Structures are given as structure tokens and as C-alpha cells.
Amino acid sequence: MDIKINDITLGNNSPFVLFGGINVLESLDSTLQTCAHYVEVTRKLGIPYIFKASFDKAARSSIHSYRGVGLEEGLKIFEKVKAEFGIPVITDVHEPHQCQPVAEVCDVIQLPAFLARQTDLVVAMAKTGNVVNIKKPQFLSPSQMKNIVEKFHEAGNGKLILCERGSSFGYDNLVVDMLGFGVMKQTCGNLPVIFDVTHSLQGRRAQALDLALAGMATRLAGLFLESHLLEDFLIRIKALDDLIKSQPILTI
Amino acid sequence: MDIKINDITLGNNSPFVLFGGINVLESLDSTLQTCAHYVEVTRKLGIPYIFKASFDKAARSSIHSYRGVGLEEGLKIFEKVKAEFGIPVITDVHEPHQCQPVAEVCDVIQLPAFLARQTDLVVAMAKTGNVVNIKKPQFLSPSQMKNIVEKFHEAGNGKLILCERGSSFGYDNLVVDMLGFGVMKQTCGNLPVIFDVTHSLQTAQALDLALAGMATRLAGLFLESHSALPLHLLEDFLIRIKALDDLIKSQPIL
Amino acid sequence: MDIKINDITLGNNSPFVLFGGINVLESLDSTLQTCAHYVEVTRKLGIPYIFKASFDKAARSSIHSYRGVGLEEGLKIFEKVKAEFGIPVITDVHEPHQCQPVAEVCDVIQLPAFLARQTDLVVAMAKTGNVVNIKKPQFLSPSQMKNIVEKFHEAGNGKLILCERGSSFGYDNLVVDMLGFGVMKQTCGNLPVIFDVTHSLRAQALDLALAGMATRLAGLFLESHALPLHLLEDFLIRIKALDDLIKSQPIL
Amino acid sequence: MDIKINDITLGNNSPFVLFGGINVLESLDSTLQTCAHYVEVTRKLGIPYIFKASFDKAARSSIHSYRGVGLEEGLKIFEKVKAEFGIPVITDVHEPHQCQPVAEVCDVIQLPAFLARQTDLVVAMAKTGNVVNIKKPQFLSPSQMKNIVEKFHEAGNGKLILCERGSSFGYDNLVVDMLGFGVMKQTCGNLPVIFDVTHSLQGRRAQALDLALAGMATRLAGLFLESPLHLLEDFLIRIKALDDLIKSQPI
Ligand SMILES: [Cl-]
Ligand SMILES: [Cl-]
Ligand SMILES: [Cl-]
Ligand SMILES: [Cl-]
Ligand SMILES: [Cl-]
Ligand SMILES: [Cl-]
Numbered sequence A: 001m002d003i004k005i006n007d008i009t010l011g012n013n014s015p016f017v018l019f020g021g022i023n024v025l026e027s028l029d030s031t032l033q034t035c036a037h038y039v040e041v042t043r044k045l046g047i048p049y050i051f052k053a054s055f056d057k058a059a060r061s062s063i064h065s066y067r068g069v070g071l072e073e074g075l076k077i078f079e080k081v082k083a084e085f086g087i088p089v090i091t092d093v094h095e096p097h098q099c100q101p102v103a104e105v106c107d108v109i110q111l112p113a114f115l116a117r118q119t120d121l122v123v124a125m126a127k128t129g130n131v132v133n134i135k136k137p138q139f140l141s142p143s144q145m146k147n148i149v150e151k152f153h154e155a156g157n158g159k160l161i162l163c164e165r166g167s168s169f170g171y172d173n174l175v176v177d178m179l180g181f182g183v184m185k186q187t188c189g190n191l192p193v194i195f196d197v198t199h200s201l202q203g204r205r206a207q208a209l210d211l212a213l214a215g216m217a218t219r220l221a222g223l224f225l226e227s228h229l230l231e232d233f234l235i236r237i238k239a240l241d242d243l244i245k246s247q248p249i250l251t252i
Numbered sequence B: 001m002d003i004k005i006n007d008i009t010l011g012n013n014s015p016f017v018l019f020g021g022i023n024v025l026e027s028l029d030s031t032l033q034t035c036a037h038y039v040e041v042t043r044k045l046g047i048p049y050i051f052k053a054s055f056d057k058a059a060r061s062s063i064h065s066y067r068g069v070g071l072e073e074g075l076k077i078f079e080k081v082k083a084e085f086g087i088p089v090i091t092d093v094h095e096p097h098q099c100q101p102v103a104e105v106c107d108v109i110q111l112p113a114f115l116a117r118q119t120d121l122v123v124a125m126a127k128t129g130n131v132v133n134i135k136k137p138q139f140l141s142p143s144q145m146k147n148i149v150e151k152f153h154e155a156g157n158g159k160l161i162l163c164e165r166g167s168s169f170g171y172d173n174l175v176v177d178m179l180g181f182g183v184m185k186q187t188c189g190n191l192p193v194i195f196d197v198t199h200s201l202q203t204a205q206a207l208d209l210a211l212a213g214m215a216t217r218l219a220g221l222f223l224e225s226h227s228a229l230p231l232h233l234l235e236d237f238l239i240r241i242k243a244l245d246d247l248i249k250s251q252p253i254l
Numbered sequence C: 001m002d003i004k005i006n007d008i009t010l011g012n013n014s015p016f017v018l019f020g021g022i023n024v025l026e027s028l029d030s031t032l033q034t035c036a037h038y039v040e041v042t043r044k045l046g047i048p049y050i051f052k053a054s055f056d057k058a059a060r061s062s063i064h065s066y067r068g069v070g071l072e073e074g075l076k077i078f079e080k081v082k083a084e085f086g087i088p089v090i091t092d093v094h095e096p097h098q099c100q101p102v103a104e105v106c107d108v109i110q111l112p113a114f115l116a117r118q119t120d121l122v123v124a125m126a127k128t129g130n131v132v133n134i135k136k137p138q139f140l141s142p143s144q145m146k147n148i149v150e151k152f153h154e155a156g157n158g159k160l161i162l163c164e165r166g167s168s169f170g171y172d173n174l175v176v177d178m179l180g181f182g183v184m185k186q187t188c189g190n191l192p193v194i195f196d197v198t199h200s201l202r203a204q205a206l207d208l209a210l211a212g213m214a215t216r217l218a219g220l221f222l223e224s225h226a227l228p229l230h231l232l233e234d235f236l237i238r239i240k241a242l243d244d245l246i247k248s249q250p251i252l
Numbered sequence D: 001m002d003i004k005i006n007d008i009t010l011g012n013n014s015p016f017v018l019f020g021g022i023n024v025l026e027s028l029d030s031t032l033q034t035c036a037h038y039v040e041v042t043r044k045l046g047i048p049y050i051f052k053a054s055f056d057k058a059a060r061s062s063i064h065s066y067r068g069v070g071l072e073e074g075l076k077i078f079e080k081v082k083a084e085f086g087i088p089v090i091t092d093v094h095e096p097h098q099c100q101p102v103a104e105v106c107d108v109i110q111l112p113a114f115l116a117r118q119t120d121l122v123v124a125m126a127k128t129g130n131v132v133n134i135k136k137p138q139f140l141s142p143s144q145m146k147n148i149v150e151k152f153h154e155a156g157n158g159k160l161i162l163c164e165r166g167s168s169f170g171y172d173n174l175v176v177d178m179l180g181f182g183v184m185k186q187t188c189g190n191l192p193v194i195f196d197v198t199h200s201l202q203g204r205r206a207q208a209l210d211l212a213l214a215g216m217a218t219r220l221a222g223l224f225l226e227s228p229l230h231l232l233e234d235f236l237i238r239i240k241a242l243d244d245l246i247k248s249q250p251i
């Protein structure tokens, strides 16, 4: 199943889409600066790109860490990003009441992994009718994603993306099960699957490259960063993605 | 560090406290009946007791699934339970706005395992001044529990209970690391540690697992009856737990 | 099912048996001194006791670290222990050819966890007719112990002990699943189950040992030097207390 | 570090080598039959090839279940495979005494995962001077492979291949950590690393392909698999395409 996001086609048989940006929105000026670099690099390689940032982060490293500029200024910033660069945007929501106003502006709404089972948030997100990025909890099995998808379906929204982030492996460590992408595709109606390589990883650029390449080898709709260094990285991902997507899936 | 809950002393070197009850509040009469059995059984056994139930099941598998009586009905039932039996109660909270109203009624307020990183919920809970039960997420190591505790301390609340409920072990399975209890005591300033045997079993062995955990010298046991233990077996179950706890607590700390 | 080992009754409903001693047999005089201390303490507390050591460490830190005194000298040392103290002894074997000579001297012969699936060693051990201690591999689930047991049963030996040593938990780490004891009892005909706390890993050793013994076990398996040898008495007083309590109550 | 196995160059920046064949040797004819197909497919695709088989299944579930032809007959079959096809071969050894005789015939000798810490077997294998395939145990961290490599070096053999076969993931399940490949390369002096996709698993054809592709994306010396037929062709075409791309990019 493909998802149209403005002029972008997001799907597991389509050229991969890059999701990336900044952690939290501070100001228009800071935002445009970072977004501009992503846009320049991706445009240079012809890679579809969706800008990501949080406007109000509930899961913070410390209590008093800045949550972001908040809903009102945040959405004004996103509106400006969309107008200036002509790209779609993505943000996370954690309050059911925030889903509707966010969806007026943000093309994709993101369900944080820790809230992925919370019924009221899922329903509120579904009812926006927007594209939804479902972050996979690290303690959830790939075949358990079907139940989250079912809850969205119950609430009337099937425009869903599944976002791999790694799985709990003993204490602290995360491991990405390369077989889980296929299990999600098979059990969830071939919805677009994307790979959040950054979470999955907790030199370090070398690790990220190997892990990103391995994931994208399994034929995926997109790559998601919690992030010319970036250009060199994307050249390698694009090379592999173009190879993979240019071949038909195994014959039956 | 001990915590006083009304006349109960909760602590890792005190007699174990039963945090016992049901999955969800369903009606006043059913709640009062179940709670009366718990009170009757624990009183005769001499085990300090705190009644547990959720007012809402916020994360069921269908949006249409029954979620319980809800917050307003729920708090009315807790008020009646407290009035009738004179015991403390515990419930979980799911949204920051729920914390103060729930905390007005419920002695202990609980942070769901799925919501450990909901920093705004942590803050709202801490601000109530109530005793807090922190459910250790299945994805968090025992050494990392200190990070949640730190946040509550930064938010000005030190009346924290640490509750084991198992650790992720491959897909769709949990294991309880018996060493984790000691790690949490060591690294979180010897705050009360309790064991949720009921949610640790998520995938008959409840007694063996319960006894194993309590052998490591814990402030409390957390369990549900109706998976959960048949209510009529509670008395015989608790006889065994009490026998072992009394023994362990009688031995000098090594 | 109980197992008689000389005058000792080993079983999940009997007073726990201590399987204790040392890693590797390095000497004669030091072995006797260490054993003498285990004997004194266990006799003082009235705990059945079986002396343990390896004469040939097959899995060593380095190629050239001492494997131990070897078969012939090892068995001589075991004979001296038996003669001096009148206690049974346990040692491990690694090659089918070692099974007969070892079993003629040693009251229990042990199957190393790493070798527990090796058919030729299993058959050779079984055919001795000796009591056997089966170390559970860390990569093996409790419900699969019955398969090792059935291989022994096929080769004609039912005098089997099941020994817990923890399960792989992410990388370079072990966790002991307290539920595994019950699984083994239920699926393997209530054969004696014992707990190797040493190789499952210190108030740690104490917490872990007590937790395990709380589940009603035939024995506890440990090494000293590993616990400090002089703290043995305090340790066993605590274990005996819990075991005496648990074993004095009928199963529920 | 590359390893020469006859005219084959095995290394992490060389074209991937297929280590392919069957679970166990049953008979000469079927062995030659299966080997012929791998040779035919690999030759026409241009992929270096080493034929794999066990002479003994030392750890089956019943004492009576079938274990293969055994060492004496086993080695006879390998001798004939090398004669007919002129390819190198690989087999696993289970006892120290088997090492020198097996090594006389078999180009690569393999240290089973379960036995990888058996110090006498490590020494015996090292003493043959043969190329050695070290199967990483499912319980062992990738950073711990250097300890096994260190032993072979102290025993005087550095012709070592490191072979991924999955890591224990709860009970009765395996996961392959794609970051382990890089850790092994960085900590073990860039010795050839290969990927046993077959034993890492445990329709399923898509699964094996996806997993093989993911592993080979990390830039590996080889792929270790067992066999259908039509699927072998279909499988290797895709693996080669990916490997050719990856190996053409600068590190
Ligand atoms: Cl998560
Ligand atoms: Cl994100
Ligand atoms: Cl609960
Ligand atoms: Cl959890
Ligand atoms: Cl041992
Ligand atoms: Cl093991």
C-alpha cells in the first residue's frame, strides 16, 4: 500500500524517503537554517525529504529540558518551512487534544513509541485523517504491530507508516531484527515501513552506515534520522536503495 | 528508607505489605465484596494491606473494549472503600490532569510502566506530594531506575516505591531478574521495592515466582485476583508468602 | 523422583544437598584442606555434602592455563577424599573415553553445559549407569531439557539430575529464570533439580541462592576460593533456614 | 587480511565467496549431484564457490536418528568432490583426534559453535595449519571473538575466518545483530567475516533472502548457506548484485 504525501509517493516499492530535521523547535531562524541543509543535500541527490521536529516534547532527558516552542509558535514555524521549501513536515503529538490543530499544518503526525498502545491518543490521531507514523516500541514484537494498526482502522484511518526503532536485547542494548520488517509487511497489509536507524543505535558514523544499509537492503519505504558528511551517507544509501527497488520481489 | 502510609510502615526491612486487588473497577458492590475478602484474610493473617484497582484501562487491544467505570465513578468507589474499611488504596494515572484529583482520594498513585518516560506525568505526580508507585518498564534495566527516581527528586517528591514487573526476554516473553531488586536498592537509596508477580507472568507458577522474589527481602508484594489468582486461594497463597517473609526479615542483613 | 547417592537422599522434597568445592584440581594437600572445611561446616549444620572439582578443565582462559591434574592423578585425589571424609564426589567429563574410568571412582559424573547436546558423550555417560548431573546450556530453554533427558533414557540411564546455570540475556550476561525450575520438574518427571549459583553469576550470590531455593530444589551447587571459603558457614546457615522452612510445608 | 584458498581470494573487500552445500553427507551420488548444481549455478553467475558438508551430525535429537556417512566414508566423498570438480571444500570437526586426518583432505576445517570454547579442539585445529572457520556461538558477544582469535594465534594459526550464525534472543529464538560484523572486523584485525544465514534462521525463502541481503550490505567476505534449486539461482543473482555494488564503494 502506497501513501501520497503531497507530491511524494511513500511505499516499500518506491524510492526511499528521508525523514530528518531537528530534535525540538526553538525558533524560525534556527529551524530554517537546519532544514535548508537537509533540503540542499537531498535536492542535490534527488531524494524525497520530509522535515521533522518536535514542538512540545513530553519525553525529555530532564524535567527542565526545553520542551519546544509549543503548539502555537511551532505550527507557525512548520507553516513557514512548508511555504519556503515546498516540502512536507512531520511532528509528534502526545496529547489527544493537540491532534486536530497539529493536523491542520503537519502532513504527518507521529505517535511516540511509549504511547503507541494508548487508546485515546490513537483514536484522536486517527480522527485527524492525516498520515500517521507509528513508532514501534522496543519491547513490542513485529507481529504485535498488527494490533496497533487494527486500532487505527477501528477509528477510521488507514494512512499508516510503521517505524522500526530496535528491540530490547538484554539490558540497555538494542538490536534491530532485520526479519521484523518482513513480518510487519506481511501482517499489516504491506503498509510503508521506515527505519529509525538513530534510536536503534542509542566510527559511530560507520556503525550508522552499516545498520542503515542492512535495513534498507530489506526493501523499505524510508529512512528516519534523529539527527559533506550527510551527503556521503545519503549517496551510499541511495546507491543501495536504487539497486534494491529496481529489482522485482522474488517470484512465486 | 521507609515510607509511612497512614499507620503502615513500608520498607525493605519491614514486614511485607500486600498491594492487592483487581485489574479494573467495575461496580461499587463487586469492588466492596472483593475488597472485604482481602481485608478479612489479611487482617487475620496480620499482613498490612492496600487495596489496588485501576479506574481506567487506557491501553486495551480494541478501542471498543470495556475500560472500567472511569475516573469520576472510580474515585467515588475508592472513597467508599476507604470509608468502609479504613485502608489505604492505590490506583494508576494516565494523564497529567488526572493527578491532583486522583491524589485527593487515593493514598498511593501509580505511574504505569508504559508511561515511565512521560516527563509531564512524572512532574504532575510529584507535585501532588503523594506516595508514588513507579512500575519499572520491561525495557528498563534495574540500574536505570535511578534516572526516573532522579526526576521525581528534582520535582521535589521522595516518597517513591519501586515496583518490579519483569524484563523483556526475546519477543512476547518476560523474565524476572532476581538480582535486579538488589541493584535497585543499591542505586536508588534503599527506597521500598515491591514485586508485581501478576504482571511479571505475562507471556500456576505465581507462588514459586512470588516466593523467589520475596526471598531477596522486599517491602511488598503486588498482585491481582479474579491473568490473576483465584480469589478463594488467596488465604493459602498468603500463608506461604508470610511464612517466608517472616523468616527472611528475621535474619540479620548480611 | 529421588536419587540415592550413597547414604544421601537427593530430591526436590528432601533437605537440600550442597554440591561444593573448587574449580580445578590443582593439588592434593590443598584439595584436602578445602574439602576438610566444607566437611566441618556441613557436618556442623547437618547438611548433606558432595565434594566437587574438575580434573580436566576443557574450557580454559588461555591455551596454556593449567587444565588440572588430569584423569589418573585426579581420580587418585578423588579416592583420597572419599577415603578420608566418607563423602560422595562429583566431577565432569568431556570425552566418551573418560566416562568409564571416572564413573568407577566418582559418585556423580557431570555433563558440561557446552557438551550437553553431543550424542556420543551422552550415550557414553548413560551407559556407565552412574548418577549423572546435566548442566543446562545457557542457550537452551527449560522445556527443552526433556530432550536431553530422553537421550539419556534411550541409552538406558534414568538416574539424572538437572542443573540450572542461567540463561543468555543479551550480550555477555546471564539471567536465571525462576520459572524454569518448575518447567523442568513438570516436563522431566520431577527429577532432582539443583542450582549452580556460582556459574549463574557478593550478597548477590546470597540473594540469588535464596530466590532459587525458595522454589523448592534438591540442591545448591557452588564453588569457593566463587565465594570466600571462610564465609561458607554464614552463607549455609541462611540457605538452610529457608530450605528447612520451604521443605517443611506441603506443596501448594 | 585476505586468505587464499587455492585460486579463490577470500576477504572483506573481495567479491563474496559462497560456502554452499548440504547439511550432511548421505551418499556419493547425491553429494556429487548437489555439488554439480552449485558449481553450475555459481560458474554461470561468476561467484567463487566452496562446497560445504558435514560428515557427521554429532548433536541430533535422538541417539538413533540418522547422523550421516561418518568420517572414513565422509573423507572418501570429499576426495571425489575435489577430484571431479576441482573446488575447495569445508567440513566441521567435533573431536581433537579428527583434526589432522580431516585436514589432510578438507581445505577449510570448521569449529562448531557449541564447541568454540573447547580449548583442546582449538589447539588441535590450529596445529593442522589449515584455514579455519570459527562459528561464533549464539551466547558470545561479537567483541569476544577476539579471545578465540587470540588462542589460534598463540597456537600459531592466523588463517582464520569468523562466521556469524545469530545470537540468542529469549528462548528458542535467534536474532542477527548487523552491528556485530563491524565489531568483529575492528577487533579481530579485519579477518574475513562470513554469514551463515541458514543457521541464523530458527515464505521462508523471502526471509532468508532479506536476511542475506541485510548481512551482505555490511561488506562481508562470504555467505554460508545450505540448500532449493531454482531458488538458488534467483537468490544468488540478487546477492551478487548487492555485493558487487557494496564492494565497488570506497570504505
Ligand atoms: Cl520504545
Ligand atoms: Cl523522532
Ligand atoms: Cl497494575
Ligand atoms: Cl512495560
Ligand atoms: Cl562446574
Ligand atoms: Cl552454557
Ligand SMILES: [Cl-]
Residues within 6 Å of the ligand: D092
Ligand atoms: Cl554448518
Ligand SMILES: [Cl-]
Residues within 6 Å of the ligand: D113, D114, D136, D137, D138, D139
Ligand atoms: Cl550456538
Ligand code: NA
Residues within 6 Å of the ligand: C102, C103, C104, C105, C106, C107, C108, C130
Ligand atoms: Na561411580
